[model samples]
Target: EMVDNLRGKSGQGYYVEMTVGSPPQTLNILVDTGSSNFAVGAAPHPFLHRYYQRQLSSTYRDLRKGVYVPYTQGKWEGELGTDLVSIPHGPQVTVRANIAAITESDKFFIQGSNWEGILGLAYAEIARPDDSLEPFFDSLVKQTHVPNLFSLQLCGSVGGSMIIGGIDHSLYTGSLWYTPIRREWYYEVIIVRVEINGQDLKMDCKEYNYDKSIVDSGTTNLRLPKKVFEAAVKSIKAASSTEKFPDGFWLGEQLVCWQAGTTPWNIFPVISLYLMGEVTQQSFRITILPQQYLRPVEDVATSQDDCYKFAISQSSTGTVMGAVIMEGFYVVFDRARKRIGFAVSACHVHDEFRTAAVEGPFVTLDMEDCGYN
Candidate 1:
């Protein structure tokens, strides 16, 4: 998550400011591939839970009459609404989208988000109250596609593409990584390999119980199955002996060290999550992140830990790619071509995944090490 001296929230998406009812407000938002809609932080209503209560006191027009998105898992249903979304160095347009906010009788659970809400570009997976946003973009392409498309080069976390508006040509090397899209708008493919330390672990696709993996621009973590998650932690721990924190595991003392000697772990390995590839029969590695930064937390079994729970936080049934692994690359998602591409990001793996052979005068745990500057 460290690039030069930059800190968290530094790699932010375009900001959108708007007005609701009376008060004016602005919310930072990320473009979402797992969803389709343009919703924002609004006034907390009675139905909203305490966790996702960011109701902006603004006056605005509602486009609920035009658009509708149906994304429901369990009891949570995704709705589509329209709002005046203002983009930086871009034109302000009225777009329709699903709200991440809670609905009547349906409690919405969300936290640690800086933006007001998300802008969904995927087809309505839950339910559709209206036509998809493709038509809107088609019109844009006709007028004069400014960006044409939007691709994210997430350096580290579940790195991949989330193309919106259109796809950018500069983000790809050659043939794009392609996979069959479930008739639905959101792309669904088998995640087979998660590579680290030159080792590849096949994801337990059988246990994919409604599991979802979406290309997201708003988040900063690469989420995965519990097994893969543990493997990543163990890989990082192999480099440093410092005991990780018990609760949240927010990098305890000497948790993460840039000093190769302290961690003395093997060369930092390049962690890549393998989604279905287009040209190759199996798949290809699209995104790359720093696996050395893997954070560890206490298991919830013997210990009632909060970190373990937070580590597995899922909006629905599946994993949503976030920023934890986006520190080093550019991502390109092509909705028209139905392909995702990647180019080397600005940050490269400083070292490889810590291996068993790494030697060192292992340092004691110090909170400052978690800073890993």
Candidate 2:
């Protein structure tokens, strides 16, 4: 998962897995923040079961010459083709969508293959020869300047979520926290500081390597470097020894308690990641690793213990700040300017996002004392 880098808005250009046009086959979609584009990675099939399927007119074409996308970490195996995909909701719009055959390596949610595949939202400023989705959205904008932008409010971890052709009035209103546009990867920003509990962890943004971070809904968790990740895990694990999880990481009980001075105690500390316009503060949403994946390492080869673990190494903390912490918060994706805003989601109304966040709606945050405001 890309973790916490995405165009912050509820869901603008983020992928949705509804079946569209033709025999409904859930497809992995990219909700892009960079540019607006609507296309699927490949066509629908019976095997793709993550999202609801749709019916679409078939356009038989030889996509043998289509190029493959260079994804982030995982690799996808599939062939590309073009077909008419019809949206199940709204006006029941149907458009040409390229389809790709999926394989084990190309595993995705059928609806959402996290950390991989993206939906373009920017104006196609960087369209490519293989930009299949570009034409569809481009056409929408051309035909009716009305459906130019789409928004969403992904309710929770799972359990049916939603995406709409327009912004939810209850989500935000009035002025937005806008920032100047930068490259389309992550919302590049300078982290002025990160306070673990009351102590100042560090202000060295360079330590994280990536200066330009993409704020994406496509990513589900808070993705950070191993060092930073371990420091976080160590803090939390110390609080409560967790059973091993499939991710090779440890997970504590529902309530993970950290030692007051241990690195793990940093668990509930305030994470203030400063960006261009405003600072995004995140509080404790930490969970202990599940017990199934813990494995013992020998040299570089692993024993049977490794069988349960995915590629994630036990000693390695390959983690990302994903939707885990983002669920209750109102992530402000301000394309109007080019900055990101984050605050506790308002209780009754989301439209007054800035006001709600600034006003400290009703959420009690662990890191609020770290000058997170």
Candidate 3:
């Protein structure tokens, strides 16, 4: 449960408190659904406060295989092994996990962080050079009595919950919508249309996934492709009632400030997405208000009253519906049925604010012959 006082802060990579090995070396591991590799720091560095001492764990078995995984701005080289992993907060079950002990890293990514390691919750397709290697979540489903699904509630205050093998009914409200899982790598899905204040982007549907659309928890921003970015910005600027539409607010890396206690939610328009759904081969609509896309930027050193930045940016590679979208709903990664489910988040539950989240099964026949190939 999240309180109103903890709202402004957001979620990107949520953490899971878990213990590894025989005696169990306890650490906070960042939950990443973008990649497949459960790795932890094993070496001493100035950037890192601690390490998971490999020699301390009696149940550790060295696999004698070197592993390497590169993130957005950083990378790490490590060795693989097997160990008993216990999620203290998750379902009461322990499983033998294929773990990577990082000996060296770029010192840029893990620096000044609360998490000590990473727990990749994706398919084995992205796992480091092995067909036999299974992600930690897969091993959990195989070894435990729990269901084969996980739910993530990104409350933005870092007060969200990640329930492996179960979906807490208390975190969501109303009906739940499910979409087909296109590929196994990074929870891949297809986006048919992006609607801005009830106005859809006037273009073909296939352009939404020219490269590929995915829901990645590791990415902080809602990245859109070239033309979509420009079109959405244009529509938003035109729809807005106020005339003071700043330039840098739409551009990346620029911080737009507001008066003290002033919210620009009224100035920005609500954004919506028409995602391809399973079961009946139809589409569903998911909308996020200004609070999600026009997120607050916290910088203690700045003298600005209220600085905020556009959480949605232009993507060079493809469209990535990151934390900006996930924070708005209770997301379900159901591996048993190869589908993703969504419901109204509990944290976003408010009197009139509840209506801000417009969701339901949207019937659309515009996507003629939509292909995932």
Candidate 4:
């Protein structure tokens, strides 16, 4: 599961590499759990570097159905089809897979991505067109008889690793503290509390899990519920007032930079999330340091000293723990046990999994309606 990062972390809409079609026409696909449609650019457009040539593949089978996957700012329409798919450095098996050969798109293919396809990982309930459709991972799981699990290490810059149907033991520390999946749609979880520099936000737990909370691989930042994002940002800002950062800083719309080699780590506070564990009685705290949120950007850096971007942002949808924080750990989607695992990563620091956690008694938020209803 090699990753392609175009502009470092902030520039990252990171995706994986996979070989599709007979004779293996290579295509870089974004591994997205927030969606259920496996779509690739089949027709060349201005945005894509290349497209999957359906006619060249002897194993191609076209279905008459049409698909339209709509995003917040984008959407793509395609023709449904089947092809022999082999993960270049993933799943490790060849399976005849159902896919959408996208012939048209709007903003779906943009400067934010360096890929031609998206390998959606969500369950079939949200699949487009009809319930008869099967997702990419589901077909991979069934056809190859792989385990009902897959793990990801979104290591930045250099391509990271992903092991489908199993966990790469060496990548994580130990038994991953599993968070129960609240729904079968996205990789949902209950967020009980948020901490700023070891200080609890002691606000109502309900505010934290407002709307819903999901571990979405498709997203780039840790998007908080509107109020929660404001509250958390306020607390974090209060703690960092010593630096008196500009107003545009927290907006995440402007780039914030410092002198060469003067990366502002000491000014920022460590942010942590208390996710509901296997049992509602307990919660696991997953802490992310400044390195996760204070991402340094290279492409826009004015000098040798790189400019930094505030990676955390407010969400209109739900709370999303995206690549920003996910890069700090090796995440395992233990679908078999209906849980998502977070373990210390070799990629970040911890050498260690149901797979990792700082456990404590549950809070009121743990029992709140956090899943998608």
Model 2 over residues 278-297: C-alpha lDDT tens digits? 33342222111221112112
Candidate 3 — worst ten consecutive residues by lDDT sum?
A: 1-10
TM-score to native of every candidate shown: 0.56, 0.55, 0.91, 0.90
What C-alpha lDDT values do all the predictions have?
0.41, 0.37, 0.77, 0.77
Q: Is 1 or 3 the stronger prediction by TM-score?
A: 3
Runs with alpha carbons beyond 4 Å of true place in candidate 1: 1-27, 44-86, 91-114, 127-148, 154-183, 202-212, 230-269, 286-316, 347-373
Q: Mark the 10 consecutive residues where model 4 has the least summed lDDT.
A: 349-358
Q: What TM value does model 2 have?
A: 0.55
Candidate 4's displacement at residue 195, Å, is 1.2
Candidate 3, 229-335: lDDT as tens digits:
88988988887757564687788568677776776566677788878877454778788887777777666765447777788889876788887788858889998
Residue 344 in candidate 4, Cα distance off native in Å: 0.6
Best by TM-score: 3
Task: Tell me the lDDT of model 1 at 223.
Answer: 57
- Which candidate do you rate higher for lDDT, 2 or 3? 3
Task: Evaluate residue 243 in candidate 2 and report its C-alpha lDDT on the 0 to 100 scale.
Answer: 38
Write down the RMSD of all candidates, one decimal each: 11.6, 10.6, 2.9, 3.6
